[PDB]
């Protein structure tokens, strides 16, 4: 078993980009990977996993969101720091 702490991993953010703009998510996070050596090392070398905040079902306003990981081997244990973040989901247009 092997383990790597990877710094400065980008966070993708998914949402209705047509109507909304979302501020507050960090641009990067720290990801910890553990599992079989070959798989941990390939993930570190290629960094082909994806950390994301999915705000597709969010309503306008302030909230919190847990960060997810995809495109990652099923043989790895993964955690993200910070695990959850504050977000501000704003409408691109103003009604005031
Ligand atoms: Cl904000």
Q: Range of 57's domain?
A: 1-96
47 Cα–ligand 1 center, Å: 27
Method: X-ray
CA dihedral 84, 86, 90, 95 (to 10 degrees): 140
Contacts of 91 (CB under 8 A, 6+ apart): 19, 20, 60
Residue 31 burial by Cβ neighbours in a 10 Å radius (0-12, 13-18, 19+): buried
Phi, psi at residue 12, to the nearest 5°? -85, 150
Read off the DSSP letter of residue 33: E
24 Cα–ligand 1 center, Å: 4
Contacts of 68 (CB under 8 A, 6+ apart): 51, 52, 53, 54
> In angstroms, how far is CA 11 from the centroid of its own chain?
4
- Total domains in the fold of the chain: 1
91 Cα–ligand 1 center, Å: 13
SS3 annotation, 50-92:
EEEEECCCCCCEEEEEECEEECCCCCCEEEEECCEEEEEEEEC
Could you tell me the CATH number of the domain that includes residue 77? 2.170.120.30
67 Cα–ligand 1 center, Å: 16
């Amino acid at each position: 078993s092997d383990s790597e702490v990877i710094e400065n991993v980008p966070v993708k953010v998914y949402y209705d980009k047509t109507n909304l703009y979302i501020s507050g998510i960090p641009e990067t996070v720290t990801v910890t990977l553990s599992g079989p050596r070959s798989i941990v090392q390939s993930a570190k070398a290629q960094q082909d996993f994806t950390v994301y905040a999915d705000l597709k079902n969010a309503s306008i306003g302030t909230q919190e969101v847990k960060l997810q990981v995809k495109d990652v081997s099923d043989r790895l244990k993964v955690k993200v720091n910070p695990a959850t973040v504050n977000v501000n989901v704003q409408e691109k247009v103003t009604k005031k």
